[PDB]
Amino acid sequence: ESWAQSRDEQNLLQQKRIWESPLLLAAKDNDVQALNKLLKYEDCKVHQRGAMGETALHIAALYDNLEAAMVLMEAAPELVFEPMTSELYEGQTALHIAVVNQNMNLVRALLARRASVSARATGTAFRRSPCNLIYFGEHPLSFAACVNSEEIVRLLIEHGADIRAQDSLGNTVLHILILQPNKTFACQMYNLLLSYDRHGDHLQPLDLVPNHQGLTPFKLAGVEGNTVMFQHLMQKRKHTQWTYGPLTSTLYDLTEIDSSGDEQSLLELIITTKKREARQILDQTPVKELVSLKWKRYGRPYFCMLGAIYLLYIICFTMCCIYRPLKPRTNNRTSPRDNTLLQQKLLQEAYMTPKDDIRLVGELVTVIGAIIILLVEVPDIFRMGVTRFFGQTILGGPFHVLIITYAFMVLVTMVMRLISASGEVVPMSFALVLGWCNVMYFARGFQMLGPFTIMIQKMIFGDLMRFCWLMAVVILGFASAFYIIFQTEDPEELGHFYDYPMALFSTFELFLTIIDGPANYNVDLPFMYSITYAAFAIIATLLMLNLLIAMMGDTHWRVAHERDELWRAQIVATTVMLERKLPRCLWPRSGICGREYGLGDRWFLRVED
Amino acid sequence: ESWAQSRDEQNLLQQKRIWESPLLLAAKDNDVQALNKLLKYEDCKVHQRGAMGETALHIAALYDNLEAAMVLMEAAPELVFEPMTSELYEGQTALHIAVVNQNMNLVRALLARRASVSARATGTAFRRSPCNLIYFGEHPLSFAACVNSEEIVRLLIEHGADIRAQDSLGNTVLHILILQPNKTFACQMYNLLLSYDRHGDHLQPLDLVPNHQGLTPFKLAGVEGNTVMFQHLMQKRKHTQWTYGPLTSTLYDLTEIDSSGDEQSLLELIITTKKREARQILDQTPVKELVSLKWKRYGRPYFCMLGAIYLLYIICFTMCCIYRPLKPRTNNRTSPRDNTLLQQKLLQEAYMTPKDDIRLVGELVTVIGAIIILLVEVPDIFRMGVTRFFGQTILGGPFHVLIITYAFMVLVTMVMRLISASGEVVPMSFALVLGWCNVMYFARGFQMLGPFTIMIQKMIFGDLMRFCWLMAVVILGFASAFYIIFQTEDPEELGHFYDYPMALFSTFELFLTIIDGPANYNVDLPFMYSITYAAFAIIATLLMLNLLIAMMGDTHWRVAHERDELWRAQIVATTVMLERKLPRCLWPRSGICGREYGLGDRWFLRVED
């Protein structure tokens, strides 16, 4: 908004300063005879700074004027050593500009005049931002690699441009190629820049240098969803054992792919990222066979065993609420609308029979199981982001909130049982609902229920929320109308709208048609009731069929191919989680280690095809 | 109907008069030896007028007879100065006909005989009508431009045909090209006719001359939805600042596009028009970035702020109806069907406690807010069309009617409160429903609810109306059958159909299944009831599933791509409305003005691409 307005004013201010400067105007439209006469007058301000700190050589490079750029260079060679000075294009020399324009006659002329090939374009328009259309890095090698200029990238390296140079983000030129929109040119420019890594004395290969986030180019291809660069980079990690007719046994390196646990791996990065195209990497041929085999061998048995424990635990909590201690009430009824018969016992009376001691066993099992949930969920999100990266795992998984909220409602029921507080049915009823609805976390391990259950998550976070905002507006209008229509009437015949919170709840139930329409037929109802309830019935039939259309076309050709891809992504997210919190004796590491096969200390996945 | 019948009889009358005239028949089938002998006899009626005022040169031009047309011209040259005289083809000379047929040998022969290139074909078959298949303008330059004849348009201009000539609609030849079905030939014929605007002494360029509606050719391309002519015309208004590799900074003129407020602009014309293809112009690259930036910067905050005020106002009106003054009834009940307990107070008793004065604050806030609605909606539609162009904005927006009807129902409740009239629940109940259902006007500002809420409008104005006409027919048959089946029975057991207005309302509720089927089981019902209610239940299950099919296929591949385009069109209609009624201090004008950048007094939108 405001900064994009400020960029627009500086770009218009650039064009004004070109027109009102006879030096800069001459370089824009290649009037070399105008370049002569301003130098015939005096050896004047070639140190004219424009709006973005332009010099006239920067103007001649931007508008692709060869002959205009020459006259600046013989008259003042020092303008090749000058960068732009403004905050928007800081550090950019005319070497950067001639490379991006692919003006090769100009960039040969600049390298003849020792133009600095290590100049860092550190301006704001060169950062990797949502508000910059290019991210070319900041070195002229990085700018040449992104414009697909195989001649200039050779020309700069043969004049001393360093292929080891990083940016403020730490991205080397191999990282920057992965961030490029034309992914096929990036593969050709990958191999050429990797070919100049002849040096076996630079301590580390170029494809193994991490950026400041600690990602290598291989791992950065997985995070960005760059499936084209991912398949290309993986062929360096293949090793074909044999070829038997149509058969081919291929051996995969599985080093940065597999979750080793010391550093964040390629499986962990893809699960925790916001790119939709990173999920496409899970179907690639090292990663697909890797995570499907550790699911079938070890992930799925340790998930169904972990669901059978949660099922027996939630039956144990359920029985402790069915058999909760209750005694007949003491006082008399305050009013004839008082429905209550029983009340909960105090702590002294709650354990005075042998049936109360079998319950006390299950209540302690419930308390312990709720603490263990808080011992494994509450600390392990503090080492992550407390609310933000936790909340980014809520859009990935809502069952983080639901089982923490379950375990809190249980310990609230414990504290209310200790201090003998009235109203234990409130935290119990939240916990029975939350604790049972957490069983459909375990629907993802079953191939029948798994894809069905993600479609729940898409429609609660989507279309059912769109419906409920417009439902609550219609309810607030009609519950208020139904309240005042029956505000004069006797409530002993038709009590649906007797006060305003019940009128509001009756209209919600009439909207969903889960209670019948109010009718007596023995008494006269207001005529305004039938007019209003007819209009209410049409608007509800409109909305509840609008939802059924909206839930439809969003979920047949839009997310039906996505729900099965997100089910396979939940298998990976479940397996990465179960491998992380279980010890190595329970989880044998995937692949086959070397060192007894001559392959090293790396772990290999053999895929026969 | 009648006039299309009259056109058909004149076209058959033309062919009869050709056959029974030996002059006109000879020119139709190119019998030049028959043309000789009628002139050998006498210098006879070459002034023969046919049915549409044809002469024989008009016949020879219509049937593409070169050699037949020559014999008319040497024998009588004055027939090139004659137009057709009938009302259907008035003004049409043989110059018009030879141009439309692209008979270039004939039109060179006519221009050799000083044929009038400024002749106005003002006949009814040349007007822009739904009942004419061509709109070619009315000058021979306009006819040449529409048949794609680049040779004849040069030939007429080099004989003196004026490119500044307008029609009865005021359309110059550049306007007429935009109205043409082959839009790609129109772009080539645009540039050629714009090339002959060498004259810098004709006070105004050809692309800047308005028609009688005040539209220029650029604005007429937006109104007609001519997206091909729109992109072509916009390239005259671009200005490329620089080109940096793949980047390009383009500067857009934004003069006739942006709502300046003095004259109707291109954004205002497209919103208020009935063409569906004009909505395609909103996705074009000056217009899309313009209206998305003024929505995100200024349109959406002033719309959510304006919805938060309407939400607090409608809660204030709601509480003033919940706490409406009511007293216990005075008289005794007229009958045991009288349900009423309370009645509304008179004006004297209505304000006699401190709780009635807090309500009086909110009641005055309600009265003032209803007048302000009538001060900003009722005058500003009178300056528009009172009912017609107002009603054309009802098919655009139904919330014009709904918030005017709300504000009327509030002031009716005020007048009923003043004169102390019984029955204030009737205008209150309409106003609670209307006032709350106007909150989903503000669903369009939210990207989640916006596309959902237009699908409400498509289905109430569409499929739910188709259902309700056929519902009311089925209800009127079965409520009448259910009335007479229980007409003999005792109503104290089953009172659903006790009189005819309740039988009609019960059948409506039984149709929508919002009340249960009438049953007693303690008494014998008529056997005709079970037969009828079974047939009623099948026909309702037929219809309510027919609707669910009809609401489906009309709204998945038919309007699902249209509902999102109509949501973006509502953003534009909301933004044009909010810019129009808010002052310039609240709304900073979009773009960047010139005059401090050497660009003039125009306002420019920079788009980097």
Ligand SMILES: CCCCCCCC/C=C\CCCCCCCC(=O)O[C@@H](COC(=O)CCCCCCCCCCCCCCC)COP(=O)([O-])OCC[N+](C)(C)C
């Ligand atoms: C996904 C959806 C989420 C939203 C859920 C919201 C759904 C609704 C949930 C909650 C809303 C209701 C809360 C209060 C209800 C009871 C309060 C009460 O005690 O009653 C008192 C006040 O009664 C009133 O009339 C004041 C409340 C006006 C309702 C306006 C909505 C407020 C929120 C707007 C939000 C906009 C939402 C739409 C967005 C634009 C009076 O009632 P009584 O006891 O009968 O006394 C009669 C007087 N007598 C004593 C003289 C006899």
Ligand SMILES: CCCCCCCC/C=C\CCCCCCCC(=O)O[C@@H](COC(=O)CCCCCCCCCCCCCCC)COP(=O)([O-])OCC[N+](C)(C)C
């Ligand atoms: C989107 C849909 C829009 C249309 C909505 C329409 C839906 C319906 C809405 C309104 C229609 C009903 C209006 C009158 C109802 C009550 C009148 C009354 O006082 O009752 C009296 C007359 O009762 C009758 O039988 C006469 C009315 C016959 C109904 C024919 C339809 C009229 C409109 C056709 C339009 C066609 C529509 C389809 C298009 C082709 C008698 O009733 P009673 O009190 O029981 O007295 C018993 C006699 N006793 C005293 C001897 C005991």
Ligand SMILES: CC(C)CCC[C@@H](C)[C@H]1CC[C@H]2[C@@H]3CC=C4C[C@@H](OC(=O)CCC(=O)O)CC[C@]4(C)[C@H]3CC[C@]12C
């Ligand atoms: C007295 C004792 C024996 C009671 C028994 C306790 C178990 C039934 C509890 C204790 C810890 C629980 C586990 C703690 C952590 C998790 C992770 C949790 O993961 C998510 O919900 C992730 C969210 C998402 O990705 O959607 C699923 C339940 C599970 C396996 C829990 C399953 C039930 C467990 C084993």
Ligand SMILES: CC(C)CCC[C@@H](C)[C@H]1CC[C@H]2[C@@H]3CC=C4C[C@@H](OC(=O)CCC(=O)O)CC[C@]4(C)[C@H]3CC[C@]12C
């Ligand atoms: C005692 C009552 C008042 C409890 C209060 C209601 C809410 C606190 C709870 C009750 C049931 C819960 C829901 C039960 C089931 C689901 C489905 C669940 O969807 C999935 O299974 C995710 C997709 C997948 O992993 O396959 C998302 C959470 C949600 C909506 C839960 C959200 C929180 C809810 C509404």
Ligand SMILES: CC(C)CCC[C@@H](C)[C@H]1CC[C@H]2[C@@H]3CC=C4C[C@@H](OC(=O)CCC(=O)O)CC[C@]4(C)[C@H]3CC[C@]12C
């Ligand atoms: C997003 C989904 C889960 C719900 C969609 C709308 C809800 C936010 C609203 C709409 C109608 C509301 C209900 C309508 C009115 C009432 C009565 C209200 O009254 C009371 O406090 C006591 C019970 C009574 O008197 O009815 C209690 C909340 C409740 C059930 C409301 C709970 C919240 C609801 C479901």
Ligand SMILES: CC(C)CCC[C@@H](C)[C@H]1CC[C@H]2[C@@H]3CC=C4C[C@@H](OC(=O)CCC(=O)O)CC[C@]4(C)[C@H]3CC[C@]12C
């Ligand atoms: C005592 C006072 C402070 C009461 C508060 C009054 C406001 C709540 C009212 C007064 C004027 C109203 C506005 C008058 C005009 C309009 C235009 C109206 O536009 C349409 O409905 C267009 C129809 C369509 O395009 O569908 C939407 C509501 C709105 C913003 C109204 C919103 C509510 C406002 C600000």
Ligand SMILES: CC(C)CCC[C@@H](C)[C@H]1CC[C@H]2[C@@H]3CC=C4C[C@@H](OC(=O)CCC(=O)O)CC[C@]4(C)[C@H]3CC[C@]12C
């Ligand atoms: C007290 C009772 C008897 C009131 C009488 C009923 C009608 C006078 C009112 C009640 C609710 C109104 C409806 C409430 C909501 C809508 C949705 C609305 O659709 C939109 O939101 C338009 C699309 C968009 O702009 O996104 C169109 C009008 C309509 C059908 C209204 C039409 C007029 C209705 C039926």
Ligand SMILES: CC(C)CCC[C@@H](C)[C@H]1CC[C@H]2[C@@H]3CC=C4C[C@@H](OC(=O)CCC(=O)O)CC[C@]4(C)[C@H]3CC[C@]12C
């Ligand atoms: C287009 C949508 C909004 C409605 C679809 C059909 C309506 C035009 C008709 C069909 C059935 C009609 C209802 C059926 C019968 C009655 C009873 C009638 O009786 C009375 O006057 C008092 C109440 C009673 O005795 O039932 C009042 C109107 C009402 C509700 C009618 C209102 C108009 C309705 C909804």
Ligand SMILES: Clc1ccc(CO[C@@H](Cn2ccnc2)c2ccc(Cl)cc2Cl)cc1
């Ligand atoms: Cl919400 C929900 C989530 C998970 C399950 C597990 O359901 C198990 C059945 N099962 C086994 C022991 N107790 C129940 C199951 C379901 C389907 C198939 Cl095809 C196969 C199996 Cl084994 C059930 C409901």
Ligand SMILES: Clc1ccc(CO[C@@H](Cn2ccnc2)c2ccc(Cl)cc2Cl)cc1
């Ligand atoms: Cl019919 C209808 C029309 C408009 C709204 C506005 O709803 C707001 C919520 N809100 C804020 C204050 N009071 C309610 C909202 C809805 C959805 C999303 Cl994604 C985001 C927001 Cl902020 C609600 C119902």
